[PDB]
Amino acid sequence: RQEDFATVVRSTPLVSLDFIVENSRGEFLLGKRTNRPAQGYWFVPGGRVQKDETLEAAFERLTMAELGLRLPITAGQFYGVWQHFYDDNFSGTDFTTHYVVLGFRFRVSEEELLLDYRWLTSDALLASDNVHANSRAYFLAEKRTGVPGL
Amino acid sequence: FLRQEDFATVVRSTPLVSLDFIVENSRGEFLLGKRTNRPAQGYWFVPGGRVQKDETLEAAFERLTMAELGLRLPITAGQFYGVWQHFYDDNFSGTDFTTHYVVLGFRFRVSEEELLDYRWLTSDALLASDNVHANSRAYFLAEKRTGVPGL
Numbered sequence: 001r002q003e004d005f006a007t008v009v010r011s012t013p014l015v016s017l018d019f020i021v022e023n024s025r026g027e028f029l030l031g032k033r034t035n036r037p038a039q040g041y042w043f044v045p046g047g048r049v050q051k052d053e054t055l056e057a058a059f060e061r062l063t064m065a066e067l068g069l070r071l072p073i074t075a076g077q078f079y080g081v082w083q084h085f086y087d088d089n090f091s092g093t094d095f096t097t098h099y100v101v102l103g104f105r106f107r108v109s110e111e112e113l114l115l116d117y118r119w120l121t122s123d124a125l126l127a128s129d130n131v132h133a134n135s136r137a138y139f140l141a142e143k144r145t146g147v148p149g150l
Numbered sequence: 151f152l153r154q155e156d157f158a159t160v161v162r163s164t165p166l167v168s169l170d171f172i173v174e175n176s177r178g179e180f181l182l183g184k185r186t187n188r189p190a191q192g193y194w195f196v197p198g199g200r201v202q203k204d205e206t207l208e209a210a211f212e213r214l215t216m217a218e219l220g221l222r223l224p225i226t227a228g229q230f231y232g233v234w235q236h237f238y239d240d241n242f243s244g245t246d247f248t249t250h251y252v253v254l255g256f257r258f259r260v261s262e263e264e265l266l267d268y269r270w271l272t273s274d275a276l277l278a279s280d281n282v283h284a285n286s287r288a289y290f291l292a293e294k295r296t297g298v299p300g301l
Contacts, residue, residue, distance in 0.1 A: 004159050004162075004163050005163065007156050007159045007160070007163075008159065008160055008163050008164045010156075010203070011152055011156055011157070011159075011160050011203055012160045012164060012166065012167075012202075012203050013167045013201055013202075013203060014164065015164075015165045015167060015252045049165055049252065051162070051163055051164055051165060051248075051250055052237060052248055052250050053165075054235060055233065055235055055252070055299065056297075073297070073299070074297065078233075078299040078300050080300075081207065081233065081254060081300070083206060083207060085204065096203075096204055098203055098204050100167045100201065100207075100252070102233060102299060104299075146208075146225075146226075148207065148225075148230040148254060148300065149230055149233075149299070149300035
C-alpha cells in the first residue's frame, strides 16, 4: 500500500537487482522509466526485492517480468554491490530514494525475449544523455573501482 | 531518525540492509556477541548492523566497525565476503511479523587486545555450538558458500 511504501522509502534503503543484459550484437538492454525517481531517463532493467523473498526467487521473477525470459541467479554473473541515491521518490519531491543494488551481468539472444525498450552499444549508451548516470556507471571503469564484489 | 511505528512499518514491508563482520584474531578465532533483544534473542552472532537511509556503504562500515568493535576501520580493510540473506520469524518488537535482512559480509583480521557479552571462538567451536545462530554458522560452512553472490 502507498502510505506504507512512502514511509519505507523515506526511512530505509530499498534492495534491488539490476541487469546488465548483452545481446549477440554487443549491445545492452535499456528501458524507459515512466515514473519517479529519474523520470523519463533510460535505465538497465531491474527491480526491488520484496519482503521475505529470496535473492534466487527475486532474480527469477524479475528476469521474467523485465526481460520476458525467466533465468536463474546462476545464469547471472555477479556484478558487485552498487548504491543509487535520488533526490526524489515515486510519489514526488518531498523525500529522497536510496537503493542498495545487486548488479548481474549476462548474455542473451535478443530474439528470445518477451518485451519502451532499446538496445545500445557500450559507446552509444555512454554518449547518450537520455540514459541515466546510474546506468552509464556500470560501463565506466572509474565507477567499478571500490565496488564490493568487483 | 525513525519513530517506533515507522520502523515497524519498515520491518513489516521491506528487507533491511546490513553489514556483517567476520572478525578473526591472532589465534584464528572469530568474534561472536550474544543478542539480548529480539530478533533471535539469546543466540550468538558475528558483529554487525543495518545500513541506514542515505548512508553510503563506506560510511556504514566505518560507523559500524567503531560502534561494534571500538575500532574505526575503512571499508578497504575488509574483504568482501558475499551477499547473504537472513530471515527471522520475529522482530525487534515481538512476534507479530517477520524480519528480513539482505546482508553484506566482510572478513578481516584484528589484534584482539586493540578492540574496545562476547566470545572468541574457532570455527570448529562455533559450528558445534547450539547457541551460535545458523545465520552466523553459515559463514563457516562449505555447503553454504555455494551460490552466494560475490563469493
